Amino acid sequence: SHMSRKIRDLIESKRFQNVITAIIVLNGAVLGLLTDTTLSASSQNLLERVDQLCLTIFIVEISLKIYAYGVRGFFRSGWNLFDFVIVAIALMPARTFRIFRVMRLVSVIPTMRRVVQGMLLALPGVGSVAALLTVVFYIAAVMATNLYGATFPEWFGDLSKSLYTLFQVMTLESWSMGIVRPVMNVHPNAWVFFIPFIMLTTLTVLNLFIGIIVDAMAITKEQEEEAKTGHHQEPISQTLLHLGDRLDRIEKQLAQN
Amino acid sequence: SHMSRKIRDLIESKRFQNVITAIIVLNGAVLGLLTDTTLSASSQNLLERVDQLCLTIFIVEISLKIYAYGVRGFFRSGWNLFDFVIVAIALMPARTFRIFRVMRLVSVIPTMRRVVQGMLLALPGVGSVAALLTVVFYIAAVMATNLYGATFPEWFGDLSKSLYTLFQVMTLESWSMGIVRPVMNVHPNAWVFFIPFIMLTTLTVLNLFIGIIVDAMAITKEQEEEAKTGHHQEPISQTLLHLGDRLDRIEKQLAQN
Amino acid sequence: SHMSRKIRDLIESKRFQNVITAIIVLNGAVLGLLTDTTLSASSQNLLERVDQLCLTIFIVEISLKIYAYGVRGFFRSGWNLFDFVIVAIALMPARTFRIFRVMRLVSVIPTMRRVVQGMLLALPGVGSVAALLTVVFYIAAVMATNLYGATFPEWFGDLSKSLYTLFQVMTLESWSMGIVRPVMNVHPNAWVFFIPFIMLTTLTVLNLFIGIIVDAMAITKEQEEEAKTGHHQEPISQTLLHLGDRLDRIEKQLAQN
Amino acid sequence: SHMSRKIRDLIESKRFQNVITAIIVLNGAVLGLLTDTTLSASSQNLLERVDQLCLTIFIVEISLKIYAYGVRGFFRSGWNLFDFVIVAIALMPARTFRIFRVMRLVSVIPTMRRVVQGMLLALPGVGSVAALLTVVFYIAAVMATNLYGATFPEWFGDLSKSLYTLFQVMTLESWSMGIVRPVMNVHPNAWVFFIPFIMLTTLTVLNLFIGIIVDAMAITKEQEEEAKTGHHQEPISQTLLHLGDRLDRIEKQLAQN
Ligand SMILES: C=C(C)[C@H]1CCC(C)C[C@@H]1c1c(O)cc(CCCCC)cc1O
Ligand SMILES: C=C(C)[C@H]1CCC(C)C[C@@H]1c1c(O)cc(CCCCC)cc1O
Ligand SMILES: C=C(C)[C@H]1CCC(C)C[C@@H]1c1c(O)cc(CCCCC)cc1O
Ligand SMILES: C=C(C)[C@H]1CCC(C)C[C@@H]1c1c(O)cc(CCCCC)cc1O
Ligand code: NA
Ligand code: NA
Ligand code: NA
């Protein structure tokens, strides 16, 4: 099929990506201008028409891809499905957050798409650290609700309220002037609860963050190498393994020969 | 003993771990529901019955382990002793924090158990940094108590009070608007005390945290490798040492042969 | 040209750099003294005369460089152009920030100039992470303006106002006591907006910062090596590549010979 | 001299260090107890007598060292001079901070002494980053004093006041609710000043901190190795250099032989 192959090659061109990137930027600029509550009716109609035009250009773009690659081939990519959901949601009249269309900058620009991929692929490796943090938060929230809920109902009156103020305490935001000094006026030993909670959760959150950053950076760096040269660099352990194999080949020809 | 070996293999199965994991989750969910002060008497009785059931299932689980492995073999593991303490404490009627039973998720799930092990084994390596921080805190607290205790008794009136507000100052929480600008109204040179205290303690705490995270991550990564393949990767220094040994063997067969 | 070569060698001397460094420090000290609103008219005239003298010394210094290196040779350096802009701006009477002349300490001291160079050369490598953060900020600001602008106009009444309070929220500054608890009094589910915003942006900002620091440190370390020894250290991958080439040369002389 | 050699070996024993460590701890405990303003006269006299005893034990300890090693040999160590200054300052009656005697725990315990040594030896390597931060702070303080000093004299009325509130702003402490939103009520564009100041200084401070931590950890790790085994591990570049030398020796015996 020469027509399908001319469309797929048009889609894959740098100028097609640049034109779609320009329409995403324009659509996001009119949605940002539409937040201004002082616009005239004519200005609002005008900007809403550019939003309706921007959306239809994405509809033509997506339909072109579903014909050039096929339904099976298009929906086999997570980024094509993501783009399809964003544009198909707009054809649902009864949602209300059109600005999420600017996320398509991530899916459309490959260098930005590799940053997200690296962050997503790094998440499984830190799953046990995230589960440990989740476990500490849950136990702390139950303890805080039972200990301080009757005396401090706005902050600890229920599990949800305790989870919220423990997240604020973990971020160090007014943890002492705002929360723990007011609580110690009633419960003088409360520092025994909150100070170890802060020590354990700030250490665990920083471990979770560093674990993601280190892995994500190395994954994205490997993905960038593959996109440019077709392959990525081999690990230092594999480089030293191939040297050992070459050393054993030389050793074999020294005892025999 | 075929009975003991059938029980130990039942205990070590993935489905036994999955059922115990489900009971820990259920027990934690009813303890969290029991924080709600608006429940009916019947709902409270109902949830308290699920807690009593969850506890007895853990009693059967632990007793099965003490019979399949033996008293010496069971108590030779730090994680078995930890599980035993958590369940045996519940049989002590006169404590009040049943939610600590959710910590058994760490001991029961091996990937979570290796995160904790890595963090614990990393603590000795940062002991001198933690002692240095402790020494700075103690000296600062004595200085702050003597300098500001009479003028600012709520924050520095005693050693305990000074330790608490120096921990708040180290976390940067309202250190200036809340503490040091009010103190400089009376003691204009107080910034000479508090600014170097913040510089030294935030640097030392970050060193302590990074030291733990780096070591803990590498230890847990080695422990994960041993659990899957039976062995961990050798250090790069040991890889280069074995190459030098192979180089000397080739060198020996070049001068002689 | 012996005169041009004697001037260029005078300019390149350590004592010329030390004298210019002293004049930048003196100029910055008089500009700092000139901030004091309690000075006498004579003291102000005196300090303003030292500023006019300091500026003319820089004019002689720059003119000497433009004659010893030539217009093409001088303006071929980004640091010479930067120095020229700083001193030429002062000859524009109608701007108002003479203290920017102290930035010349960075351009004049080579070790400080290499720290900046390392930070600047690290920026392209983190461009996709910075663009991702920018995209999240923009989407969040539009969402916050539409959701909270009518109820909270001081913080979210317009796009600019929302960008500002989201930057404050990302820095964790009074995010809960100051912004999100007041907003949840009207919109109880606002935590669904702000807590994921904080999680995503603090992770992304830390990734952006670490990415810059790691690259900048390695670039500056390579630039320092080149300035002292004429060359920098080769990467470990290139060291292992040259060993493989030497291994293949030994392998060639083992099968043939 | 058998007497001098028996004293030096007594001084260098683990039990002498343990006894001096116990006296430093005891001295610090009585100085902390002496902060309590509710003690009786007899309790104060009692604790002050233990402080006078603790000091004299350090005087005997230091005098023993000056006789066993000699004046030249003792004062040739930075840690011996540091210990001498701390104890000799106490014999100066006219200062007031005896708690600084607890710093001797760092000088007396070798593992703690190596943490400090690693941090001190790391400082020269980050000197250009610290100078860059200092330069940004100075320029910002002059700009802030001239821009906001007349309208906001408590925070920016003078250079010293501006340096203080810029350090608070850099630590993110109430930077917006406390400082920049009150300043933007008068100067609406002030965010153009403060937001880039925060971006640049938090990045630079984190670079300064990471640079210290990374170097200090590696230096202390090398110093610990030398103290235990007499030598430290060689760098990976030097390990690969010795392999290249062995490769050239094998290459020499392949073409000739
Ligand atoms: C100074 C503070 C508050 C920081 C920096 C130091 C440490 C060790 C950790 C702190 C931290 C938090 O406490 C919370 C969050 C948000 C985490 C959202 C996902 C769970 C990020 C974060 O870096
Ligand atoms: C921005 C802040 C406050 C952070 C991030 C930057 C640095 C350098 C250090 C700061 C910090 C603290 O000051 C205190 C704690 C709790 C330590 C509990 C165990 C001793 C964690 C923490 O990361
Ligand atoms: C405890 C806080 C606030 C810190 C430390 C922990 C994390 C993960 C991130 C936080 C952070 C911010 O949220 C914002 C800025 C300024 C960024 C300006 C350029 C975009 C620096 C910064 O380190
Ligand atoms: C969340 C905050 C405030 C932290 C963590 C994130 C960053 C990037 C930097 C911040 C920071 C400061 O702004 C100031 C200090 C004290 C420095 C004293 C010596 C100059 C330590 C510090 O870690
Ligand atoms: Na903070
Ligand atoms: Na705060
Ligand atoms: Na605050």
Author numbering:
A (entry chain A), B (entry chain A), C (entry chain A), D (entry chain A): -1 to 92, 100 to 262
Text from the published report:
Voltage-gated sodium channels (Navs) specifically enable the passage of sodium ions across cell membranes, contributing to the electrical signalling in cells. Mutations in hNavs have been associated with a range of channelopathies, including pain, epilepsy, and heart disorders, making them major targets for drug development. The NavMs channel has been shown to be an excellent exemplar for hNavs as it exhibits highly similar functional, conductance, and drug-binding (similar IC50 values) characteristics, as well as sequence and structural homologies.
CBD is located at the ends of the fenestrations that lie closest to the central pore, and protrudes into (and blocks) the central transmembrane cavity, just below the sodium ion selectivity filter. There is experimental electron density and enough room (third panel from left) for four CBD molecules in this region, although one would be sufficient to block sodium ion passage, as seen from the HOLE depictions and pore radius plots, which show the size of the transmembrane pathway with and without different numbers of CBD molecules; their blockage clearly provides a mechanism for channel inhibition as well as a basis for understanding the concentration-dependence of the drug effects. Each binding site is comprised of 11 residues from three different subunits in NavMs (shown in detail and in different colours in Figure 1D & E). It should be noted here, that this region of the apo structure also exhibits some electron density (but has a different size and shape), which has been attributed to detergent molecules. The (2Fo-Fc) electron density map of the CBD complex clearly indicates that in these crystals the site is occupied by CBD rather than by detergent. The CBD-binding site is a novel site, near to, but not coincident with, known analgesic binding sites in sodium channels. The binding site is located at the pore end of the transmembrane fenestrations which enable the ingress of hydrophobic molecules into the channel lumen, hence this may also provide the pathway for CBD to enter and block the channels.
